[PDB]
């Protein structure tokens, strides 16, 4: 159909820009944040993929929860996630952000950032290598490609 074809091509166009223009928030906790820095380093340059760090959550599309989320920090992480405008995606990195990590049975650690914010991608490791995080970012990009928002709207 003409309408279905138009909405499919338009959805592919929209998903391409979001897929190829990821702007993660400058946000790191604990040891896992160093692997983000090595990913940004020349060896595994994230900028060549369209992945550019931005400081303001308003101008950010992806939150990389990289490191341990504590009880004293959870309100701030939730606040910045809320202040980040839609569409927004979440990549948790490392065992601490995935589940509890080395500090699962701790009185002051949140056993998983998904108790606070909806997580789109989980990157396993302690810390995951820069290659592993780059693979996670590419997997997030492929996940973005499969979104069909205009196709859902047209058939709604």
């Amino acid at each position: 159909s003409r309408g279905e074809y138009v909405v499919a091509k338009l959805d592919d166009l929209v998903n391409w820009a979001r897929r190829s223009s990821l702007w993660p928030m400058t946000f790191g906790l604990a040891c896992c944040a160093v692997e983000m820095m090595h990913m940004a380093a020349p060896r595994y340059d994230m900028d060549r993929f369209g992945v550019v760090f931005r400081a303001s959550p308003r101008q950010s599309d992806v939150m990389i929860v990289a490191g341990t989320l504590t009880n004293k920090m959870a309100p701030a992480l939730r606040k910045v996630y809320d202040q980040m405008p839609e569409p927004r995606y979440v990549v948790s990195m490392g065992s601490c952000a995935n589940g509890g990590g080395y500090y699962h049975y701790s009185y002051s650690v949140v056993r998983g950032c998904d108790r606070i914010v909806p997580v789109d991608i989980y990157v396993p490791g302690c810390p995951p290598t820069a290659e592993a995080l780059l693979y996670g970012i590419l997997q997030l990009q492929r996940k973005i490609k499969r979104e069909k928002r205009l196709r859902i709207w047209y058939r709604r």
């Binding site: 569409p87 998904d114 108790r115 914010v117 909806p118 997580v119 859902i152 709604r156």
Partner: protein, 341 residues
């Protein structure tokens, strides 16, 4: 009971509540509240969705690992309905639109889909079925919404005789229609009201109260085949209610009478939007219609929930509609509206 369905724990996040609930229309306002309550209780929740998976993201942190399961379903697909209700002992029906799209109408969302869900659930052996209807569901109602509501309620009762049919009056909350719709008339200059809102009496009900009643109806053993009416504790005139809404929002209130046919034409103009319409003729009819009084039907007090008055939770919804000048004004700063009891 099956050994896996025996409740365990202290009713926390990681406990077992023995409830396996398929929540149709969970990607909505009442749906999200009900799913949150179920997950907090510690139940197995299945979320049938037809929308984009991105729009189901907020439901993920609502339960522990493996308790929320997302399965794609189609409204006119009994195979998908059976797939999503195969292993659940409770089925909750909250599907409903306030407008009519090209493919789905009020007949589809309120008669065909609820009847299909009720009939397929009966074949699958689902123990309990909760079905959400409207309080002002009249077979000869002026609104197609309410006519379809009544017909679908009859069909659901015919298909699943052991159902619990809940009839909320007018749900108000953060992501609601009621308070937001009445507080969003700022942009169109004044507030158009039919007969200046002097002939309409409404008693809105709190969303958390509705969700708690829905949860309690599941745990109540002697609410199997019943009909409950969920209404608020206070009844207001429409004029008084809108005046209180604008007073809490700290917006100037300039009401004016608009004849019913003119308001219907205005609603007809606004419903040509392919996206979610701001208002429709059916919405205008429902707003003008007065909330019915049904003393014989049980309610929140019968289910064990004390209805929360509007004056306590109005500031949760209407503080967003204020400006920086009045953002920090306290809850007590605005006098309660004039009730009609």
């Amino acid at each position: 009971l099956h050994h896996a369905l025996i409740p365990h724990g202290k009713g926390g996040r990681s406990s077992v509540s023995g409830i396996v609930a398929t929540v149709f229309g969970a990607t909505g306002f009442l749906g999200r509240y009900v799913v949150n309550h179920l997950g907090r209780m510690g139940s197995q929740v299945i979320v049938p969705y037809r929308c984009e998976p991105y729009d189901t993201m907020h439901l993920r942190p609502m339960g522990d690992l493996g308790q929320i399961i997302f399965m794609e379903w189609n409204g006119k697909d009994k195979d998908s309905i059976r797939k999503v209700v195969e292993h659940s002992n409770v089925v909750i029906n909250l599907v409903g639109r306030e407008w009519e799209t090209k493919n789905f109408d009020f007949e589809d969302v309120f008669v065909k889909i609820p009847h299909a869900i009720a009939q397929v659930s009966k074949e699958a052996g689902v123990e309990k079925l909760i079905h959400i209807s409207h309080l002002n569901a009249d077979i000869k109602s002026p609104s197609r919404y309410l006519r379809s509501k009544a017909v679908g309620e009859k069909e659901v009762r015919a298909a699943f005789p052991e159902a619990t049919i809940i009839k909320p009056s007018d749900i108000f909350g953060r992501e609601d229609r009621f308070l937001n719709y009445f507080a969003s008339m700022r942009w169109f200059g004044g507030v158009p009201l039919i007969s200046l809102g002097k002939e309409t009496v409404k008693q809105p009900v709190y969303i958390v109260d509705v969700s708690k009643g829905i949860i309690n109806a599941i745990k109540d053993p002697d609410a199997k085949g019943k009909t409950f009416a969920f209404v608020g504790p206070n009844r207001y005139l429409l004029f008084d209610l809108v005046q209180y809404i604008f007073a809490v929002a700290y917006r100037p209130f300039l009401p004016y009478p608009l004849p019913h046919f003119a308001y219907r034409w205005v609603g007809r103009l606004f419903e040509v939007s392919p996206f979610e319409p701001w208002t429709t003729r059916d919405k205008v009819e429902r707003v003008h219609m007065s909330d019915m009084t049904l003393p014989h039907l049980p309610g929140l007090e019968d289910l064990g929930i004390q209805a929360t008055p509007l004056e306590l939770k109005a500031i949760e919804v209407l503080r967003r509609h204020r400006t920086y000048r009045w953002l920090t004004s306290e809850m007590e700063d605005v006098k309660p509206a004039k009730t009609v009891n």
